[model samples]
Target: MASGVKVDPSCKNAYDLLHNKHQHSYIIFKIDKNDTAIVVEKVGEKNAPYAEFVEEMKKLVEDGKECRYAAVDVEVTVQRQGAEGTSTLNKVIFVQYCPDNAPVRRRMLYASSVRALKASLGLESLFQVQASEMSDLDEKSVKSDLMSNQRI
Candidate 1:
């Protein structure tokens, strides 16, 4: 099936079977800043510990390097069948992180359950680390700098 959409050859099968009766699915992609190349990686089934990936991205941010765009796509199936009828719910969430300096530029497509989605995205630890880093900034100095910059 040639859909004209390019896919990573390393794990094409996983992407192909994403929406086919799968309980859990995840794919992560890293795109180059120049739009030259893209690398795709498929994570675990039930539990995907992406600690290494998170750390690498964090390092890029810390080093003041332009971290290329990164994205994560997740699909989760929640089964809720009662005496009324048989039904299954499929939730798909897509999140992308842009290297822009703006705060609210990053986009999130859909989230069925915040708790479950956060776990899948490995956001709990990431947010903690980010918060700690932000707290280290001197509030008074930052305010003064902002005022100075605004006056220019």
Candidate 2:
């Protein structure tokens, strides 16, 4: 018979720590006495705008246009449907865009891994993440979370 790998609590703890601390840019927490629910509406057609942006970026790469820095945008949000006090799991989406001149291929690796994980878990992507050129790349990046690093 084949044996399964042992699950370690320390590994899980480490992951949880990293996730709670470094994964997000900010967090929000609130308590309400009244029964209120949140809603999210997509008022337009579902399209892969980020894919288009990447395609354009590829063209820039092929034309010898050196990209000094790139801005990757990711948005993740949740809506409460059922009861008032139900909680949602914390999530994080990391994006790294580097110059094509470098041999690191970090973006390629990240895309491949994220795709595989989403497929294996039957997870649905919330939004199409897009990257654009900005005067200052670092300032253009954004992240959202519901908890603070200190609290985590």
Candidate 3:
């Protein structure tokens, strides 16, 4: 279950800033040059819109032509049953962006290496999503998943 991938020190620090300090909206990471370490690729400023966050992730794959690992500290509205009305909830989403168009080997590397990154961040309990295409990153779908404790 371990890929033996070394997560760079900065990765955990960045996760802390976003998860505990609430200083960042999202983070994108990729396997470093030697494909042995996970490094931060970008950090979306706090309160940035979801559209902007998705754009950055899309750009990462388009230009780099490789898979990526990302996480988001996002808020969504959840309508409660009865007269509870609408409320908001915040959750962290860990996503692996491995497009089907990319080489099989490239996709496999990220798929297998995510555990290392997750363990490093102590995110084993966090919601994780497997995204192979842009639509797979749709916000509406993510919201539904959050409401149901489903990773769909």
By TM-score, the candidates rank as: 3, 1, 2
- Clashes in model 2: which pairs? 27-145
Better of 1 and 2 by lDDT: 1
Candidate 2: segments with Cα more than 4 A from true spot: 1-91, 104-111, 121-123, 126-139, 143-152
How do the residues 40-149 of candidate 3 rate in per-residue lDDT, one tens digit apiece?
98888888887887777766566755787778777665655433665556677887777667776656666667777776786778888877778877866766787665
Off by over 4 Å in 3: 80-83, 150-152
- Local lDDT at 83 for model 1: 25
Q: Where does candidate 3 have its weakest 10-residue lDDT segment?
A: 79-88
lDDT of 1 by residue, 44-83 (tens): 4533444544554555566442323232233222223432
lDDT of 3: 0.75
CA RMSD, predictions in order? 15.2, 17.6, 2.9
For residue 14, model 3's alpha carbon misses the true position, in angstroms, by 1.1
* Cα-based lDDT for every prediction: 0.35, 0.30, 0.75
Best by TM-score: 3
Model 1, C-alpha of 95: deviation from truth (Å): 1.2
Residue pairs whose backbone atoms clash in candidate 1? none
